[PDB]
Design an enzyme around this catalytic site. Structure first.
Site: not given
Length: 346
Positions: A119, A171, A165, A83
């Site tokens: 998502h 991400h 995001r 991440r």
């Protein structure tokens, strides 16, 4: 012949810093976008609105969402992805160089591997169906206006989701790009499978059983070789700025059973006799009835979502979550329309 992807990782980190340093008066908007794109908006809101406008779109939307979730979990087990945060405080790439500055929001500090963007993939797989179905339906109507408006809207939604995001340091850009592309692929390939309609009750049971059995078998096989499935916990704990923000969870099978319950509930509702006289009845497909059914389903489901299963026992938690996920489609096409038809009785 294998070299590191620190190039992509640094490109992601610099993208996050670039987004964060300028748009410092937009954190609320990005949080709101990230919380709406949650998939508990296609089984509770989008499905009952599209199922009654046209019965074919709702089934396709639900199937795409369920398959997207299953693929998300299965591929997430085996990819070991990092991440944006948690990679600049650990790697030694900026050892002889300077380290950028990343700030952590409460929505950040996720505890799971982030190789497929859940998502983004769910949003793509759910919105492509809506856009294409609306375009197909509005063919009875010089046509390069509605088409362009719809496609620009879809791409704006996708871009906003990806930016949300990235901005929260959750991400990398390539993860969300791959997720969007995979979601588009799954929607496109379900747009042609025509055996999902008018399916027998025995077939739904076999499909659900196969999905559950394959998931469990794969989960055991990876444990049977020497693959670690808990590396995300300790590292997230150590590099998260506040332990209170961390949301440690003890459910290895959390969304799997929910998706399977939704699928089984849809099968039971479609093949149950009560649906045949309620939604396929005699002279009850006039539009105000459909609108009333949509409104009632939305309100009752929103009120009904405000429950939590007991976590003192794990098996009971799983069973109750499965039952709730099965009730979600079993109470929006079968019992509420029949009750409204009986109200139309007097």
């Amino acid at each position: 012949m294998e070299e590191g992807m620190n190039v992509l990782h640094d490109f992601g980190i610099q993208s996050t810093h670039y987004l964060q340093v300028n748009y410092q008066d937009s954190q609320d908007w990005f949080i709101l976008v990230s919380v709406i794109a949650d998939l508990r908006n296609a089984f509770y809101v989008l499905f009952p609105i599209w199922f009654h406008l046209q019965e074919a779109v709702g089934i396709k939307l639900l199937w795409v969402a369920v398959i997207g979730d299953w693929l998300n979990l299965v591929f997430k087990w085996i990819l070991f992805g990092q991440r944006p945060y948690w990679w600049v405080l650990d790697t030694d790439y900026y050892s002889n160089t300077s380290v950028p500055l990343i700030k952590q929001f409460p929505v950040t500090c996720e505890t799971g591997p982030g190789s497929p963007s859940g998502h983004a993939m769910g949003t793509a797989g759910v919105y492509y169906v809506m856009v294409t179905s609306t375009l197909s339906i509005f063919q009875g109507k010089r046509f390069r206006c509605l088409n362009v408006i719809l496609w620009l809207g879809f791409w704006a939604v996708q871009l906003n989701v990806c930016l949300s995001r990235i901005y929260l340091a959750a991400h990398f850009p390539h993860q969300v790009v791959a997720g969007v592309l995979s979601g588009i692929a799954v929607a496109e390939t379900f747009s042609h499978i025509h055996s999902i309609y008018n399916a027998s009750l025995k077939k739904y049971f076999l499909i659900t059983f196969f999905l559950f059995s394959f998931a469990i078998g794969f989960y055991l096989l990876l444990k049977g070789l020497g693959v670690d499935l808990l590396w995300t916990l300790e590292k997230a704990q150590r590099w998260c700025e506040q332990p209170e923000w961390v949301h440690i969870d003890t459910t290895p099978f959390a969304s799997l059973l929910k998706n399977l319950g939704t699928l089984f509930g849809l099968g039971l509702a479609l093949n149950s006799s009560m649906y045949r006289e309620s939604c396929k009845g005699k002279l009850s497909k006039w539009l105000p009835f459909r609108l009333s059914s949509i409104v009632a389903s939305l309100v009752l489901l929103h009120v009904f979502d405000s429950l939590k299963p007991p976590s003192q026992v794990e098996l009971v938690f799983y069973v109750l979550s499965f039952c709730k996920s099965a009730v979600v489609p079993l109470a929006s096409v079968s019992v509420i329309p029949y009750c409204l038809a009986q109200v139309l009785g007097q």
